[PDB]
């Protein structure tokens, strides 16, 4: 779920398993080093959603849909400046790929129950 | 049992004191001990200009550092040498244990 995705993004921040963006994420996809993927459709996205769907849906890649790109910019580890209260500005990244090692958490079981149904 | 122990120091007095201490320890040990072999003294000479400038009278100063070396031969194994040389050593002297 959403809190499980937030906790596994915090785990990726706490043990640097973040493949954020499209370039190194596509390199990890082509290098068979992709475990979990998140996608953000229904935005200003005429054909970019078609390109990211064609690149992601290749070899058993599952997605979690996010309504807005700025909603996931608080905990991914990107806009980590000016931590006195709210951050200075939140920007949106499209797709985040998680490559964590510490799988002894219930959030992994929650997201695997989401995927396996 | 032909061992040769070198003893080098900056000082002469403490060198002779620790040499006489080891000699009287070997004599109280009732062991055949050789005398001290006074090596020739090597002198390190440095002459340089006293001033940092090029101005003034051409005056030079002389620096010395004498080196004194002593030799002791003994007829005991290494543990007796260790137990006689590991106690009450001068801070200026240094040792080197060899076997031949």
């Amino acid at each position: 779920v959403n809190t499980a995705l937030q906790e596994v993004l915090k785990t990726a921040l706490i043990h640097d398993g973040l493949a954020r963006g499209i370039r190194e994420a596509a390199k990890a996809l082509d290098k068979r080093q992709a475990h979990l993927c998140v996608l953000a459709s229904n935005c200003d996205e005429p054909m970019y959603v078609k390109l990211v769907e064609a690149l992601c849906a290749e070899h058993q890649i599952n997605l979690i849909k996010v309504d807005d790109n700025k909603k996931l910019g608080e905990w991914v580890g990107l806009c980590k400046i000016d931590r006195e209260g709210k951050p200075r500005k939140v920007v949106g990244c499209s797709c985040v790929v998680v490559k964590d090692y510490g799988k002894e958490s219930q959030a992994k079981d929650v997201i695997e129950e989401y995927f396996k149904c | 049992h032909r061992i040769r122990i070198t003893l080098t120091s900056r000082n002469v007095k403490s060198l002779e004191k620790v040499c006489a201490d080891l000699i009287r320890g070997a004599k109280e040990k009732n062991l055949k001990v050789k005398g001290p072999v006074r090596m020739p003294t090597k002198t390190l000479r440095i002459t340089t200009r006293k001033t940092p400038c090029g101005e003034g009278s051409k005056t030079w100063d002389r620096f010395q550092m004498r080196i004194h070396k002593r030799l002791i031969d003994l007829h005991s194994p290494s543990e007796i040498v260790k137990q006689i040389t590991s106690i009450s050593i001068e801070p200026g002297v240094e040792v080197e244990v060899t076997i031949a």
Binding site: - | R10, L44, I46, T48, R49, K50, P52, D61, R62, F63, Q64, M65
Partner: protein, 55 residues
């Protein structure tokens, strides 16, 4: 090729190969007995090496 041109000049020898231990100066170096100091700072720190002046 900046990474191979910044240090393209060899420094195996010459005056720039030597450097003072205390002030990184190329002038007035002593190489006797492996000291590698300038003359002024050797005069300043002459006492604690063991070099005494009695001639």
């Amino acid at each position: 090729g900046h990474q191979q041109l910044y240090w393209s000049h060899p420094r195996k020898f010459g005056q720039g190969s030597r450097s003072c231990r205390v002030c990184s100066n190329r002038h007035g170096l002593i190489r006797k007995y492996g000291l590698n100091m300038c003359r002024q700072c050797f005069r300043q720190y002459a006492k604690d090496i063991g070099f005494i002046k009695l001639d």
